[PDB]
Amino acid sequence: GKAFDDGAFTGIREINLSYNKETAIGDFQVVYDLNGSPYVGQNHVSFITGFTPVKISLDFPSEYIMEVSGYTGNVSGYVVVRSLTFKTNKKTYGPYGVTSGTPFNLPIENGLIVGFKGSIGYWLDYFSMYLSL
Amino acid sequence: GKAFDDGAFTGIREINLSYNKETAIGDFQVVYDLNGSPYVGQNHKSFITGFTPVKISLDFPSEYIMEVSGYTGNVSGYVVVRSLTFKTNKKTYGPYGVTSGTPFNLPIENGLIVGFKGSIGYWLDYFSMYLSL
Amino acid sequence: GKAFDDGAFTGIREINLSYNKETAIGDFQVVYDLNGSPYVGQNHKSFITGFTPVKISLDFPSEYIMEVSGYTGNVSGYVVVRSLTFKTNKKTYGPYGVTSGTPFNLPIENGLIVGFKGSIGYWLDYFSMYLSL
């Protein structure tokens, strides 16, 4: 896929992603907060289409992500992120996608997710998260 | 004066300020680095004119500030920042303004200045700096 | 179980833990680095015995943990940590315990594990990690 690195910001205001009930996560874009002002991250799109879009508008700054979990599995000979779930101090968003394969979860006791980086070809190949206080 | 708060960024690429050889520091603006891209901060201008502009262009990211120093003093009944000097790992910029009053200096052994906040009326009333690793 | 919180330090020199191939992880103790000197943390023990001891001596500071993974699962009606694996930049330690249940893993791209906290009754009920730059 085509790699991307959003970098680190002040917080997260909204997550826009798309998925397919038969494959994995497609597109991924984040609207961060930059010192009190919304900052629209670049839109990392899949090479193909046919995905179901989802918009997660957080009630920033009172609501924030406390845990990110999901599944990585095989699709067409590729290991990709098949599903994602976001739990904030107010609600749980997801799961989105297919919960098959190998699970993983990142719960946070103290600190915030302030940025994303990864790779997307047909589907989300992999991703990392920036953490800060 | 009118308070401002640029917030925190990834680094500093350029500092634009103005001074008057008889009073104090006037306008103040910074071009920060945001995850590898230049980001132009709001220009914080004096309520009056007649200052001499100064552009401090840093060779980012190999060149960075190691110490900020200056003088705070009384001007027409107000305590303001009368002078500033920036020392990087490559050279010294300044002093700019009037080197008279009470001196202050912040040397950094480990860390970086990643943001500025303060207030500007006729002159720079005061300012703080954001530090990070 | 009984909760524990070692706190944060400057690094990790050695880890001592015990496990049982039929249950889960039992005892947990860490020798941290505190500004260049070894600091022996309290030994957090299981309410019972019969575990196989293991000592992980790291070649500090050139050797450090890059990823922690394991398995959580049911044992006697409780959810506990059944296995752990420590991967450094020089070697892999483990897995230790029963690799059965739900997997989890925490790869670190930039940063360091500098402390542990958790709870231990008959077995390790759960644990968290302090991360820093």
Binding site: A8, V79, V81, F104, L106, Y130, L131 | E63 | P107, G111
Partner: peptide
């Protein structure tokens, strides 16, 4: 060392 600020980064999860 560098004039670039840094942050803790965890991951990646997915393809190697």
């Amino acid at each position: 060392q560098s004039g670039i600020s840094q942050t803790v980064i965890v991951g990646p999860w997915g393809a190697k």
